[PDB]
């Protein structure tokens, strides 16, 4: 919230249309339309079917952040017992498969712990958060000015 | 304290700490926690009764 506020206010001032913030900041559709949707254009056009520019890296990292964020959703919504009962079947399959039972694990493959899963999901969520916004802020500022 | 008396709990770990219950029985055999207190408020585990010692209960007025 803090950085959204800072960035939108300063972007509007830099382009000289501070009235846009003054008028659209009062409802959430204003933020969704005149700040996110409006300023994501150069970033999402970093690469396109018709070419690419230097912002392509930031577009790729934007999508990267979305991906890792949604991946963290996995660890945060899905909990251990399901994965443990699935890894059991996987271990059975490996032990029972010819030409791959010649190889065996030295550490029993188990599911992640409860606290471990919370931490991994939190880390994925945080990395997505930070990388998505870093891309957005740098690419939109560089494409607008 | 005697049977059918209101007693406030003084056990810190108790769901009814500093809360009032009714003494249902006091066993004089010599067990660790003789008094038995009933409560109207159920605990998280769903039990409305417990066994307390004489030093963990104070009669109310």
């Amino acid at each position: 919230w803090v950085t959204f506020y800072w960035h939108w206010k300063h972007v509007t001032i830099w382009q000289g249309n501070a009235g846009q913030f003054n008028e659209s900041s009062t409802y959430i559709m204003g933020w969704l339309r005149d700040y996110l949707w409006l300023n994501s254009s150069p970033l999402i056009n970093g690469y396109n079917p018709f070419g690419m520019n230097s912002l392509a890296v930031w577009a790729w990292m934007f999508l990267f952040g979305h991906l890792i964020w949604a991946t963290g959703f996995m660890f945060l919504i899905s909990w251990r017992g399901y994965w443990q009962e699935l890894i059991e079947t996987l271990a059975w399959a490996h032990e029972r498969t010819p030409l791959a039972n010649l190889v065996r694990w030295k550490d029993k493959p188990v599911a992640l712990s409860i606290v471990q899963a919370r931490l991994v999901g939190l880390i994925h969520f945080t990395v997505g958060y930070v990388f998505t916004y870093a891309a957005f802020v740098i690419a939109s500022t560089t494409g607008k000015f | 304290v005697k049977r059918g008396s209101q007693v406030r709990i003084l056990r810190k770990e108790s769901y009814w700490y500093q809360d009032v219950g009714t003494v249902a029985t006091i066993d004089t055999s010599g067990i660790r926690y003789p008094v038995v207190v009933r409560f109207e408020k159920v605990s998280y585990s769903g039990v409305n009764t417990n066994n307390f010692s004489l030093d963990e209960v104070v009669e109310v007025v």
């Binding site: 959430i28 559709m29 969704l32 339309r33 949707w37 994501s40 254009s41 999402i44 056009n45 970093g46 690469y47 396109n48 079917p49 690419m52 392509a56 890296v57 577009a59 790729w60 999508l63 945060l76 919504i77 899905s78 909990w79 251990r80 017992g81 399901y82 443990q84 009962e85 699935l86 059991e88 079947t89 996987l90 059975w92 399959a93 188990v110 599911a111 712990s113 409860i114 999901g121 | 408020k41 159920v42 998280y44």
Partner: protein, 741 residues
């Protein structure tokens, strides 16, 4: 013997139990010591199998609940018909269907919400509707608000009849378990009577009412000038003008001279050039043939007269060397468990809903529905969602059967037992195939995104680069295009113009044109496969491991819906079939969202559009799907960012409601994550602090406040997640399509 036996006055109608919530349950009838009691009341309201051990009681409750549901549905239909009769622009739409937007809802002018009464057309301003009721009525031959009023009256009368029947068959004449356990008789009657006579009556209605009225409407006659259906019924000469074979009568029918009816019973195929829908003269023949088929099918089972089959004999006779006893015990399982039947019926109903969505878009069945793009999109996505939910419910009730009504004694070395005895092979192989599909379907999109970002556009998986052509789908499309005259000799046109052919245009707008499949279509189809397979993995894994597993050998004792089995064994969270349904519902949402997005973009980019005087069609998006749908950036920019403009710029318009619902659905979706990412201990401790605050003021509820159970927290999170996501897509789709059509 298939016979009727009922108990008279089993339950006395009285309000005594209306004032005793939880009466149905022994643990709940005591009273609410905590707030968990309130939630349990609703979670266990309709779990009749946990109220009593009496199959007769459960079956009677289910019968009456079905009657109540039918009354509710009839009330719904009567309301829709009444709104069409009183609060709609149906007559104006009949006059000019291609210019006035259908509308049957009006809002009151209270807080400025009157803006939602947009200029739909026909001198009428209301809320544009996307349910297709106007086209249903036009196909039915309705041309007045009087007929719609009579339809609403019939719906209300049927709702009353259904509610009375439910009360009567619970409290006055409740059938017995021997009455309920008549699978042969029930299937005979459903197939023959319900379905066969329903489609026979509908064929008669189409032959006597819909066909001539729609013939005149397509001829351009005014709805006021068209005669009335009883005029058509009693004036065989008037009908013999439009369809000259009614002068012949029913002698051709009874002499098997059926070709005499080719004028109104034909196999034309294609789409009506004027309306853009299917030929009602084809639908009449379709329903007549279905009536014959169903009435014949309903004579297969033995009831009272020796002739017929016994499903027990059939099932027990169907066994082989890989299956041991085969289908033995399944007849008993299915006539003793309502949950097994519910699972089968829900799976079939959901699959049917999905099939219906696909067909009803490619073969627009109603007059003027194909060029009503909002109606088409809305119906497709709606029925897709219903299908997904029904499939997930089928998984849930399969798990419930496995936990509750599964008995190993009665299932020994049959198919069910053998499945449970090699569940590990099934789940391991499905795991591998899910991983393989995920890789070779999504890593392809990732490869394309990275190559387009690196400037190696010649290394992508695109039609202009490395190609992944769905040659099999294109081959099937070619077959269906060339079938008319060759493999369906007596059909004039293809079943759907989506396979190929000429564009069908109504009102200078595409109704249905060929849909071309390329690399992007190959990719999206394999992603559909991936998502369906993963959902199946979750649901089937839960169902198969409902009773026991290497982790929890005694899980049926814990039940179908339990939170966990503790932090031991490493952690046993979400190890129940209920939690499998929960995760599989998340994944069904994923699958259906991708499916409906694929439909929306593909249809707006390669089917829908306006046709110029040059015969060339310009589409809503204009071919952006072929070269943009191959990259996640393409989907994010050319579909979501590009098409969200209509909904985010809807303030001040009649779609401002769609904008507001867009934002509110976002709110609910985010609000779900509080329940999904969190646990019960934190909220119970926060409630402890709040209760201290309340006690400091010498008051607190007698019903002690408790945080939601673990299962209930998961359920609330999932419900809010699904509502928010589906509502966001709802607002987005409706705003976009009502703005650009």
């Amino acid at each position: 013997k298939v016979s009727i036996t009922v108990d008279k006055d089993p339950v006395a109608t009285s309000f005594e139990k209306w004032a005793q919530p939880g009466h149905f349950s022994r643990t709940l009838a005591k009273g609410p010591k905590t707030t968990t009691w309130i939630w349990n009341l609703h979670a266990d309201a309709h779990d009749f199998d946990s109220h009593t051990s009496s199959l007769e009681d459960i079956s009677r409750k289910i019968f009456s609940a079905h009657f109540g549901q039918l009354s509710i549905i009839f009330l719904w239909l009567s309301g829709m018909y009444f709104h069409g009769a009183r609060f709609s622009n149906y007559s104006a739409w009949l006059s000019n269907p291609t210019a006035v937007k259908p509308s049957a809802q009006v809002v009151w002018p209270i807080v400025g919400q009157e803006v939602l009464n947009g200029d739909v057309g026909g001198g009428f301003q209301g809320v544009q509707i996307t349910s297709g009721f106007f086209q249903i009525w036009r196909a039915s031959g309705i041309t007045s608000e009087v007929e719609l009023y009579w339809c609403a009256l019939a719906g209300l009368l049927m709702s009353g009849l259904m509610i009375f029947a439910g009360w009567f068959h619970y409290h006055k004449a409740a059938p017995k378990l021997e009455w309920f356990q008549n699978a042969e008789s029930m299937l005979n009657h459903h197939l023959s009577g319900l379905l066969g006579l329903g489609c026979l009556s509908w064929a008669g209605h189409q032959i006597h009412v819909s066909l001539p009225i729609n013939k005149l409407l397509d001829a351009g006659v005014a709805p006021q000038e068209i005669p009335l259906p009883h005029e058509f019924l009693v004036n065989r000469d008037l009908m013999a003008q439009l369809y000259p074979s009614f002068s012949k009568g029913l002698v051709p029918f009874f002499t098997l001279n059926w070709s005499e009816y080719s004028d109104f019973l034909t196999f034309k195929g294609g789409l009506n050039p004027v309306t853009g829908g299917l030929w009602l003269s084809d639908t009449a023949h379709h329903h007549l043939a279905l009536a014959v088929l169903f009435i014949v099918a309903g004579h297969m089972y033995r009831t009272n007269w020796g002739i017929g089959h016994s499903m027990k004999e059939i099932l027990e006779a169907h066994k082989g060397p890989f299956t041991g006893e085969g289908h033995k015990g399944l007849y008993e399982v299915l006539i003793t468990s309502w949950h097994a039947q519910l699972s089968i019926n829900l799976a079939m109903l959901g699959s049917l809903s999905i099939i219906i969505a696909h067909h009803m878009y490619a073969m627009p069945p109603y007059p003027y529905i194909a060029t009503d793009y909002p109606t088409q999109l809305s119906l497709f996505t709606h029925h897709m969602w219903i299908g997904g939910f029904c499939v997930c419910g089928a998984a849930a009730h399969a798990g419930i059967f496995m936990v509750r009504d599964y008995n190993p004694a009665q299932n020994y070395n049959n198919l069910l037992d053998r499945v449970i005895r090699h569940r590990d092979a099934i789940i391991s192989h499905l795991n591998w195939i899910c991983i393989f599909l995920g890789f070779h379907s999504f890593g392809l999109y990732i490869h394309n995104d990275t190559m387009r970002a690196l400037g190696r556009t010649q290394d992508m998986f695109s039609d202009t680069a490395i190609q992944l052509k769905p040659v099999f789908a294109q081959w099937v499309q070619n077959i269906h295009t060339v079938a008319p005259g060759n493999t369906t000799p007596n059909a004039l046109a293809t079943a759907s113009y989506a396979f190929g052919g000429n564009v069908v245009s109504v009102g200078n707008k595409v109704a249905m044109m060929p849909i071309s499949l390329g690399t992007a279509d190959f990719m999206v189809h394999h992603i559909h496969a991936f998502t369906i397979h993963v959902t199946v993995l979750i649901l089937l894994k839960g169902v198969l491991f409902s009773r026991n597993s290497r982790l929890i050998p005694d899980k049926a004792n814990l039940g179908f819906r339990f939170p966990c089995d503790g932090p031991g064994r490493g952690g046993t969270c979400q190890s129940s079939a209920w939690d499998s349904v929960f995760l599989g519902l998340f994944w069904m949402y994923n699958c259906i969202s991708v499916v409906i997005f694929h439909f929306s973009w593909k249809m707006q980019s390669d089917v829908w559009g306006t046709v110029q005087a040059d015969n060339t069609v310009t589409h809503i998006t204009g071919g952006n799907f072929a070269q943009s749908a191959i990259t996640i950036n393409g989907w994010l920019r050319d579909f979501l960012w590009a098409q969200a403009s209509q909904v985010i710029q809807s303030y001040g318009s009649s779609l401002s409601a769609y904008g507001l619902i867009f934002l509110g659905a976002h709110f609910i979706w985010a609000f779900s994550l509080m329940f999904l990412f969190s646990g019960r201990g934190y909220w119970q401790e926060l409630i402890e602090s709040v209760v201290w605050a309340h006690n400091k003021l010498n008051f607190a509820p007698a019903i002690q406040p408790r945080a939601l159970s673990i299962t209930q927290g998961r359920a609330v999170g999932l419900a809010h997640y699904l509502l928010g996501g589906i509502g966001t897509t709802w607002a987005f789709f409706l705003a976009r399509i009502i703005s650009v059509g």
